[PDB]
DNA sequence: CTGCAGGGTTTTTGTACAGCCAGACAGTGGAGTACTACCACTGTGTAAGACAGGCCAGATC
């Protein structure tokens, strides 16, 4: 890190790994991994969450209720928590 | 100091071999899928005032 960046932790791990996987490759993973960080969501971008709360009329406590449920059962939580909304 | 010009630097950007796995293509017969209109039918507009005519009460003469 010192010679080529100086404190850039994320990328060194990311570029070796995605491509290392697609080395002995079935592709399946490349979709999930190429989506994984910057575009988009992964889970769902907090703006899409916010809209899907505000615009379907979910009570805050109701929303969180759902969030807990989807998180605990088979999760891999999707929805973003309240304080990040 | 500016201007451009040989080449330096490191690094891009791709082509070069050759083998190989993945998943798309195409079939099927239809499955049961997913998304579609369509059907009546709804919810939110929410309280005062002005104006005419009566006529009785009661003051004023």
């Amino acid at each position: 890190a010192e010679k080529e960046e100086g404190g850039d932790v994320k990328s060194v791990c990311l570029t070796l790994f995605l491509l290392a996987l697609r080395a002995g490759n079935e592709h399946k993973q490349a979709d999930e991994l190429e989506a994984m960080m910057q575009g988009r969501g992964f889970g769902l971008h907090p703006a899409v969450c916010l809209a899907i709360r505000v615009n379907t009329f979910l009570s805050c406590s109701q929303y969180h209720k759902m969030y807990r449920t989807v998180k605990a059962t088979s999760g891999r939580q999707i929805f973003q928590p309240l304080h990040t909304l």
Side-chain angles (χ1 to χ4, degrees), chain A residues 12-50:
Chain A
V12 300
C13 309
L14 317 177
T15 167
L16 152 72
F17 181 51
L18 243 73
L19 243 54
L21 168 168
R22 189 187 28 173
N25 54 359
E26 53 160 318
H27 287 337
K28 54 181 182 178
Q29 299 177 220
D31 203 293
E32 144 69 358
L33 283 55
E34 207 303 320
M36 103 178 291
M37 295 310 201
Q38 70 284 0
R40 218 79 171 192
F42 196 94
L44 79 77
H45 194 64
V48 171
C49 179
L50 177 56

